[PDB]
Enzyme design. Structure first.
Site, PDB file in Angstrom:
ATOM      1  CG  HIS A  85      43.078 -49.743  84.653  1.00  0.00           C
ATOM      2  ND1 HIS A  85      43.740 -48.561  83.939  1.00  0.00           N
ATOM      3  CD2 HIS A  85      43.208 -50.544  83.582  1.00  0.00           C
ATOM      4  CE1 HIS A  85      44.178 -48.878  82.453  1.00  0.00           C
ATOM      5  NE2 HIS A  85      43.663 -50.045  82.675  1.00  0.00           N
ATOM      6  NE  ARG A  86      35.596 -49.859  85.433  1.00  0.00           N
ATOM      7  CZ  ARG A  86      34.557 -49.949  84.493  1.00  0.00           C
ATOM      8  NH1 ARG A  86      33.371 -49.585  85.115  1.00  0.00           N
ATOM      9  NH2 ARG A  86      34.799 -50.695  83.460  1.00  0.00           N
ATOM     10  CB  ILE A  87      39.206 -54.973  88.610  1.00  0.00           C
ATOM     11  CG1 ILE A  87      37.706 -54.819  87.737  1.00  0.00           C
ATOM     12  CG2 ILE A  87      39.320 -56.159  89.413  1.00  0.00           C
ATOM     13  CD1 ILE A  87      36.598 -54.324  88.772  1.00  0.00           C
ATOM     14  NE  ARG A 132      38.607 -32.082 101.243  1.00  0.00           N
ATOM     15  CZ  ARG A 132      37.633 -32.568 102.004  1.00  0.00           C
ATOM     16  NH1 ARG A 132      37.357 -33.568 101.982  1.00  0.00           N
ATOM     17  NH2 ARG A 132      37.107 -31.517 102.643  1.00  0.00           N
ATOM     18  NE  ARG A 180      40.212 -62.463  84.151  1.00  0.00           N
ATOM     19  CZ  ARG A 180      39.134 -63.065  84.337  1.00  0.00           C
ATOM     20  NH1 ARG A 180      38.447 -63.499  85.606  1.00  0.00           N
ATOM     21  NH2 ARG A 180      38.581 -63.244  83.254  1.00  0.00           N
ATOM     22  NE  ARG A 225      45.461 -47.014  80.704  1.00  0.00           N
ATOM     23  CZ  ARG A 225      44.651 -46.009  80.302  1.00  0.00           C
ATOM     24  NH1 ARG A 225      45.147 -45.141  79.369  1.00  0.00           N
ATOM     25  NH2 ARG A 225      43.512 -45.797  80.833  1.00  0.00           N
ATOM     26  CG  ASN A 229      41.808 -55.091  81.425  1.00  0.00           C
ATOM     27  OD1 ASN A 229      41.705 -55.479  80.119  1.00  0.00           O
ATOM     28  ND2 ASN A 229      41.708 -54.234  81.925  1.00  0.00           N
ATOM     29  CD1 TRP A 245      47.127 -47.298  87.654  1.00  0.00           C
ATOM     30  CD2 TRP A 245      49.060 -46.179  86.984  1.00  0.00           C
ATOM     31  NE1 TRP A 245      48.205 -47.957  87.782  1.00  0.00           N
ATOM     32  CE2 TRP A 245      49.205 -47.612  87.437  1.00  0.00           C
ATOM     33  CE3 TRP A 245      49.970 -45.344  86.645  1.00  0.00           C
ATOM     34  CZ2 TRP A 245      50.761 -47.930  87.694  1.00  0.00           C
ATOM     35  CZ3 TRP A 245      51.278 -45.725  86.711  1.00  0.00           C
ATOM     36  CH2 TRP A 245      51.685 -47.241  87.161  1.00  0.00           C
TER      37      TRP A 245
END
Ligand SMILES: Cc1cc2nc3c(=O)[nH]c(=O)nc-3n(C[C@H](O)[C@H](O)[C@H](O)COP(=O)(O)OP(=O)(O)OC[C@H]3O[C@@H](n4cnc5c(N)ncnc54)[C@H](O)[C@@H]3O)c2cc1C
Ligand SMILES: Cc1cc2nc3c(=O)[nH]c(=O)nc-3n(C[C@H](O)[C@H](O)[C@H](O)COP(=O)(O)OP(=O)(O)OC[C@H]3O[C@@H](n4cnc5c(N)ncnc54)[C@H](O)[C@@H]3O)c2cc1C
Ligand SMILES: Cc1cc2nc3c(=O)[nH]c(=O)nc-3n(C[C@H](O)[C@H](O)[C@H](O)COP(=O)(O)OP(=O)(O)OC[C@H]3O[C@@H](n4cnc5c(N)ncnc54)[C@H](O)[C@@H]3O)c2cc1C
Ligand SMILES: Cc1cc2nc3c(=O)[nH]c(=O)nc-3n(C[C@H](O)[C@H](O)[C@H](O)COP(=O)(O)OP(=O)(O)OC[C@H]3O[C@@H](n4cnc5c(N)ncnc54)[C@H](O)[C@@H]3O)c2cc1C
Ligand SMILES: C[C@H](Sc1nnc(O)[nH]c1=O)C(=O)O
Ligand SMILES: C[C@H](Sc1nnc(O)[nH]c1=O)C(=O)O
Ligand SMILES: C[C@H](Sc1nnc(O)[nH]c1=O)C(=O)O
Ligand SMILES: C[C@H](Sc1nnc(O)[nH]c1=O)C(=O)O
Lengths: 217, 217, 217, 217
Positions: A79-81, A90, A165, A174, A169, A76
């Site tokens: 998906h950079r945008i 941590r 949008r 997916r 994509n 998952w």
């Protein structure tokens, strides 16, 4: 509404800006903010989708809260945008919650051990790993080092903000049979929510722009 | 509410998703959706801003409708982390609307012609250009060729969807004395809207992260 | 090599990182850096392109220096997934260089004035605008205000760094008959350079992924 | 040159486009491609960095091949303004290679078990997990399901293409004492490579724009 996914995961829509008419208003740069005009407005949605003019759909935005295993969230988060904020191991103690595949997950594969024994072997190793994690935390090992012994089927949770949008994509890639089954199950839930919130855009996407092989029929 | 800017421009907020609590809920990945907890929630906003952990602010999103001259929108559209849809002069006839600077715009500059005559010379050339544009359109020249004779002070309009992180970057760079005066005037309006919608995030940004020299005092 | 475009523009490739084998090495995450293996390497390029797995092509990057009219660069700079640095009319005096369409640009349009007179009317208004610009600059008006009277057909120049994935998206949208003729002419030049530098990727893109209607035949 | 990191990881620069002069040429939009002009060119680099005008540095691009444990690569891949291609455990059998912290990793922490026994407990659980992984693969369980029992300290490998602006952001956040020690060790290696390739930009970044607390002294 929370949709349950896998044995312990879920997807829940937390907030939404815009609807199908947001995209038409943006495409026209409209001064007027009147009600739905089905015929005209659906044709413009279809024209945009048919020609690949999809920037207007960036003006519809969703925020979801997702609980998924780490190996699904790794796919998952490619998906950079989009925007993500995830629970960090941590800073917090991680819960004993793991995805254990159903014996049906191995449908179609011939194996030399029964599918119920595969399920049992997975359960067994994740219990041993969690016991080591907790032994290290209770001995004073810092959480950010102790957590490295946990397996990839531990569940995590994150908030995801994504526009329509980028979400199209995500469904192209997916909601499709080449994607791993577990993330397909999440993409089917996200598609159901998108269809409820933006029905004309969703129907236009299936008719003209959807590249996958699962959502149509 | 529309805020007027320059002689004929404006900025208007069209839609918004989220508020200050969207960022805290995302930072904590909260299951709970209860009311404001000023003390705790403001401290976390400040901590995030103080340390540069600004991804949580990506979950607050705004959509504006802006009317600005082309030379301002060219600077604006350099901000890539945002969505834009603009009125096209390929497909529509463009209106006779131009920015003409006030004689005050030349405060501090010694010129060899009076500031009122600068204003008049600008008005004159843009009237001549518009007359040529309309002469070409009415002779059958396609709009996408006729429009190339119009000057950069023609007003255009666009919708801009932007999250609060990218909008803080926009204010750092455009609400600042090194930016051109005309886009500063737009950035001051956008800052007023952001302050109204997200007061804790806005106050934290001014105290810890704002790099410009105009919004503070 | 500089390719000339329009009456006074050009595109020139300034630097390039990678080639077709950069994409195959990235797709395989290869330790080995041996020579071309046409059969295997071209099939993998085609498979990637055929299935839409185009992230490997992000590892091939180009930098171009482009000289184009402002109305073309406004369309170009809508491509956000790229880097741009443009000559600023705030800081430098802008050159008298404008795009004047050839009388052939109006092929297929019936007009009430001859195409040679359209050309002359454009030349005339841009000369009058430039004369006003220079009159204001020589009277002491700051450049950033004087330049607003110049028309959209003034040429500008910029450097553009773009990877091969984003450049394929640019060709899908700008090397296509729905794009304005002037930017098509730039997209045809960029396609010729991409074909020279990355022939297997370029041929695979035309066979499987190119959505436009000009590059094929 | 490969730099070794942790017990079995590395960072290696695979390709680079540009150098310090790429940024100055882009900032000036230069026609001329002559040699270094230290005084003038370094001052412009410093001015850009001092004022936050960092788009010119996007024209210098690097590609690295990195081998790191999954918990480090999860933090790394949060940096969205970059390109990544990683080895997939859906399609290949994953190697028995895990990060086991040195007994020094627990310096400064008082624990109820010796640091050498922490090391041994980690080694033990990852051996048991790998044995279960291989038992499932050799019984015919598909790799994409068997791999979910492996722990987060398994090493993976990826190629990363990143420009110098995004790499400065990565160093601000990961070459800093608030980042986890293991990714600091990777960020120190990446900083050494950036300093070798772009010395003026690197020195200017430390003097004016570096926000972390490790690279300076
Ligand atoms: C079946 C399958 C197998 C996969 N196998 C692997 C694998 O083996 N290894 C691996 O590393 N990944 C693998 N992936 C991940 C895949 O490489 C993509 O990272 C993921 O699908 C996100 O797609 P995206 O880049 O289109 O989305 P985003 O990152 O959300 O980008 C959305 C769109 O923005 C554009 N874009 C965004 N950033 C850039 C940029 N820097 N340059 C150019 N365009 C950009 C492109 O148009 C992109 O389609 C696989 C994915 C699938 C579905
Ligand atoms: C006073 C002033 C003078 C200017 N002069 C000029 C000029 O002479 N010529 C000129 O061309 N422009 C000029 N600009 C425009 C400037 O270069 C930027 O394009 C504009 O300020 C947008 O800033 P940004 O890149 O930070 O915003 P965005 O494009 O919105 O990016 C937001 C953040 O995302 C990141 N980012 C986005 N995309 C990338 C990428 N591909 N690589 C790395 N990081 C990325 C960076 O952190 C960036 O800060 C000037 C701007 C100002 C304010
Ligand atoms: C014939 C034609 C007519 C046009 N008419 C108009 C018009 O009337 N008005 C107008 O404003 N523009 C118009 N445009 C511009 C068009 O809207 C796009 O801005 C331009 O084509 C850039 O395309 P892009 O977004 O795909 O490229 P990029 O901005 O380079 O993006 C590359 C890919 O990254 C992804 N992406 C990048 N950023 C985002 C984001 N924030 N959200 C989701 N995905 C993202 C998408 O996959 C995108 O395809 C037109 C373009 C064409 C070709
Ligand atoms: C000490 C530390 C603790 C952390 N703790 C956590 C945690 O608990 N949970 C967690 O989820 N993450 C955590 N992170 C990850 C952190 O939230 C960021 O995801 C990571 O640091 C990448 O930073 P970035 O967004 O600046 O980089 P990139 O994603 O590379 O972006 C580069 C720049 O582009 C701009 N940008 C890119 N995309 C957008 C967008 N959509 N909107 C606006 N601007 C954009 C911003 O200017 C950004 O600085 C932590 C990181 C650190 C260093
Ligand atoms: C590291 C990769 S990334 C990836 N791999 N295969 C997919 O189907 N999707 C993805 O995003 C993995 O999951 O093994
Ligand atoms: C082409 C440039 S872009 C630019 N130039 N100067 C600014 O102050 N801001 C910007 O974005 C201009 O306006 O002249
Ligand atoms: C403002 C728009 S943007 C645009 N308009 N039409 C195109 O064909 N391409 C584009 O990018 C224009 O050029 O009129
Ligand atoms: C899921 C998070 S992401 C993150 N968490 N803490 C960091 O220091 N850096 C990061 O990127 C983690 O590693 O636990």
């Amino acid at each position: 509404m929370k949709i349950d996914i896998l044995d312990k995961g879920f997807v829940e829509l937390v907030d939404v800006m815009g609807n199908d008419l947001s995209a038409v208003r943006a495409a026209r740069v409209s001064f007027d903010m009147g009600l739905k005009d089905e015929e005209r407005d659906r044709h413009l949605i279809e024209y945009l989708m048919k020609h690949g003019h999809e920037t207007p759909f960036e003006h519809i935005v969703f925020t979801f809260h997702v609980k998924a295993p780490i190996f699904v969230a790794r796919q998952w988060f490619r998906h950079r945008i989009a925007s993500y904020n995830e629970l960090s191991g941590r800073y917090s103690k991680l819960s004993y919650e793991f995805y254990i595949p159903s014996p049906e997950r191995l449908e179609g594969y011939k194996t030399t051990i029964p599918p119920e024994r595969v399920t049992e072997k997975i359960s067994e190793i994740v219990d041993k790993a969690y016991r080591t994690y907790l032994e290290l935390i209770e001995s004073g090992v810092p959480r950010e080092v102790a957590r490295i012994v946990l397996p990839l089927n531990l569940y995590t949770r994150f908030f995801w903000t994504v526009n329509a949008r980028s979400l199209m994509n995500f469904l192209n890639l997916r909601a499709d049979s080449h994607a791993q089954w577990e993330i397909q199950q999440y993409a089917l839930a996200i598609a159901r929510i998108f269809k409820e919130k933006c029905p004309w855009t969703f129907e236009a996407f299936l008719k003209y722009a959807y590249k996958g092989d699962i959502l149509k029929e």
